[PDB]
Specification:
The complex is a heterotrimer, with one copy of chain A and two copies of chain B.
Chain A (H helix, E strand, L loop, with lengths): L5
Chain B lengths: L18 E5 L11 E6 L5 E5 L12 E7 L2 E7 L8 E9 L2 E4 L16 E5 L3 H5 L3 E10 L5 E5 L9 E3 L3 E2 L5 E3 L1 E5 L1 H4 L5 E7 L2 E2 L2 E3 L6
Classes of the chains: A little secondary structure, B mainly beta.
Chain lengths: ~5, ~220, ~220
């Protein structure tokens, strides 16, 4: 997913 | 902290469903709207099926939903295809460049039909034969369920030795595949009338035979 | 698409520094540094041990390292520890909506001598042919660790089609057997020239080729 800030 | 509460198994059937929870705290599940869910088939590549709320990455199967409720997030699979039966994980943000993963769940369809294995037996290769190696293989394809029992045979008088069998792998569907070898020499091979791989599946027995004949 | 190619087996002794590369392609070539490295032991959901190519989350033992240029990100395990045996993955964000995964490097803290794979290709017999059935079988025996790759070429042209590969299975000598199989049609097998079983085991790659002949 990693995702995201 | 905990293994993010995740049920350890979920069932269903052809065109039934199941809905699964990613359960943790207000630090992570509660906190940020980003709940990612994984589709990872038996031991292989985890796959992103959904990533924030219900955000399926353009090209994702089925009535695959994700609804976040409280500290609980949840995925929905309405279209119990066999194609699922997997280890479905979740994960959310934790802040400080931290992500914690859900713990459980291996999804199980019921209804799934029985499939009797197509046994394809392979005489030794000529190239291998020229190498002075004689190896016989018994292929087992297609079979559902997953337990398969194999036997090798000379001229009866069962005959084991130098025999291997592999433990069934899922495939192009939740249909399984196994194999089996006989590492023989030409002398063990080429003397006999035939050899024979006898395979069993839920009572039913196949038998597959080979005679030193080969054609090509 | 999962364009992040990874080495199968990666292995070492307690002490030496096993590396795990991961390659891919296109778009902003290596213009995304969203490379994330994940460990997973056989029963767990995947721990994230690295990210943003060079970054470890809170804690993560400073013996796990990251690196990346052009098309290759890498994870060096600088001083293998016993409990470093696990599955390892790469991950890259193709853009927004997109997440690409690796093939996985099963890393093994070597118990045995590292055993290089015995591969043997068999073509569809006269009889199977007589049955309007075409199957080829690439028995892969004797490797250690049980972590291999299999690619099928038709006239050197890597076909992505009808084929399966068993899981590697600890034989009665603790060496791993597998099976990749290919399912053809006597038209397509006749209408071709050559059929390669290209098998690879970290730092090696075999290709045994079978050619269509006749007799009958």
């Amino acid at each position: 997913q990693x995702h995201x800030x | 902290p905990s293994a993010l509460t995740q049920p350890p198994s979920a069932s269903g059937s052809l065109g039934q469903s199941v809905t699964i929870s990613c359960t943790g705290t207000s630090s992570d599940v509660g906190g940020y709207n980003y709940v990612s869910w994984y589709q990872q088939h038996a031991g292989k590549a985890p796959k992103v099926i959904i990533y924030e709320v219900n955000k399926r990455p353009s090209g994702v199967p089925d009535r695959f939903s994700g609804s976040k409720s409280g500290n609980t997030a949840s995925l929905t699979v309405s279209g119990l295809q066999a194609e699922d039966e997997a280890d479905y994980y979740c994960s959310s943000y934790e802040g400080s460049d931290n992500f914690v993963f859900g713990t459980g769940t291996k999804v199980t369809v019921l209804g799934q039909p029985k499939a009797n294995p197509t046994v394809t037996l392979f005489p030794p290769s000529s190239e291998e034969l020229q190498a002075n190696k004689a190896t016989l293989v018994c292929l087992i394809s297609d079979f559902y369920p997953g337990a398969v029992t194999v036997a090798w045979k000379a001229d009866g008088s069962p005959v084991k030795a130098g025999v291997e069998t592999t433990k069934p792998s899922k495939q192009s569907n939740n249909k399984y595949a196994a194999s089996s070898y006989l590492s023989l020499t030409p002398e063990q091979w080429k003397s006999h009338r035939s050899y024979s791989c006898q395979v069993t599946h839920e009572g039913s027995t196949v038998e597959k035979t080979v005679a030193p004949t080969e054609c090509s």
